[PDB]
Amino acid sequence: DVGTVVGIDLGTTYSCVGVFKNGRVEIIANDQGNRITPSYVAFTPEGERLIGDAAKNQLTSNPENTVFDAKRLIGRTWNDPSVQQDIKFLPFKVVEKKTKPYIQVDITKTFAPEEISAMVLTKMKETAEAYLGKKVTHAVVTVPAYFNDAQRQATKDAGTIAGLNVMRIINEPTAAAIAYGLDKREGEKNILVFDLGGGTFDVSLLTIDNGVFEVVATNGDTHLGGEDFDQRVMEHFIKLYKKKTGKDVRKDNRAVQKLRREVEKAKRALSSQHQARIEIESFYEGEDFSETLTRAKFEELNMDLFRSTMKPVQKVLEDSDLKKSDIDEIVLVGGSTRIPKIQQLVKEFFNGKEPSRGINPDEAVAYGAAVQAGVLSG
C-alpha cells in the first residue's frame, strides 16, 4: 500500500507540497504558516540542523555554512560547464569528490547535492504529514523540463534518502498546466508556460493533445529570478546609505542579511501597494535604518531585467514554429509573476491576451503534482 501520495515542487529557491485530501487538492502551509518553504539548509556552530524558513532567516556572520541552490548541482559531474560556472558564484564551498561536486560546510562535513535536497524533501514530507495526520511514504516530484536522465535519477535518489519512494518525476511546466485542468480537455492546444522563479527563468512551449503533453521547446535564463530583483534594490539602498551616512554596510554580513529580509518583504508589498517602508533597528554600528521604496523606483531599478524576459519568449515561439497568435493559453508560474510590471509586459507581448494566474503562481506546479499523485494513492 503506497498510502497517500504527495506532490512536491522541489524548487531551486522555494519548494511547495500539495495533496488530495477529502476529494480536493490542498496546498499545505508549513509550521510557520507559509505555503512555500525555502530550499535552504543551515548548519549551526551548536550543531542543530535548520531547514527552510529557519535556515534562510538565521542571522549569521558565517554565511558560508548556509546551503541553497543544490538543484543547480544535482545529478551533474564535476566538469559539467554549468557546475564550473556555478562554483564561482555560490557563497558556500563546493569541492570535487570522486569527480563530482560536493558541498562542504561546518556543522566539518561534505554533502552530495542529493543529500541537501533530501533534507528539503524531508521538511516538505513532515509538512504534509502534520496536515494529513499520517505517515507519507510515496511522492510525485517535479523537475525542470530540460533535466536529463541523471538529474531525474538524482532527484529520485534524494527522495530515497528522505524516506520517499518518488514514483514519478514529472516536468514543472506540465504540472502547472495540469493545475489549470488543461490535461482534461478534448482537442489540441499550444500552451506557453512563463516561469519566473526565485533564481531561474524558464519559458516552455507545450502542446497538449487529448491529455498528452509534449514539451516542444524551452528557453529562458538560468540566472535570472526574483532574488536578482532584490539585489538591485539592495545595491540601491547600500549606495544611498553610504551617501547619507558615509558607511559601507557590506562589511557586516548580519547587516546585509537584515536589509535583504526587509527588501524581500517590501518587494512583495509592492505587488499590492504603490510604496513600502523598510525599517531596521540597529542596522549598522548601532544606527537605525528607515527608508521608503516606491513601486516606480522598484520598476526603474529592474526595468532592464523585466524587459529581458521577453526575448526568451520570442525564441521559444520561433523554435516551436508558432506565432504569438497561435498561443491558446499563457500560464504564469513563480511569485515574481505577481509583479504588476511583469504581468503588464507579458500581456502586452501577447497583444492583450490575459495570462492565467487564478491559481497562485507559486503553488501551481505543486498543485499539478498533487493532481497526478491523487491517481496513484492506494
Ligand SMILES: Nc1ncnc2c1ncn2[C@H]1C[C@H](O)[C@@H](COP(=O)(O)OP(=O)(O)OP(=O)(O)O)O1
Ligand atoms: N516573489 C514575489 N515577488 C513579488 N511579489 C510577490 C512574490 N510572491 C508573492 N508576492 C506578492 C503577491 C501578493 O501581493 C503578496 C502575498 O502573496 P502570497 O504569499 O502568495 O499570499 P496570498 O496572495 O495567497 O494571500 P494570503 O496568504 O494572505 O491569503 O505577495
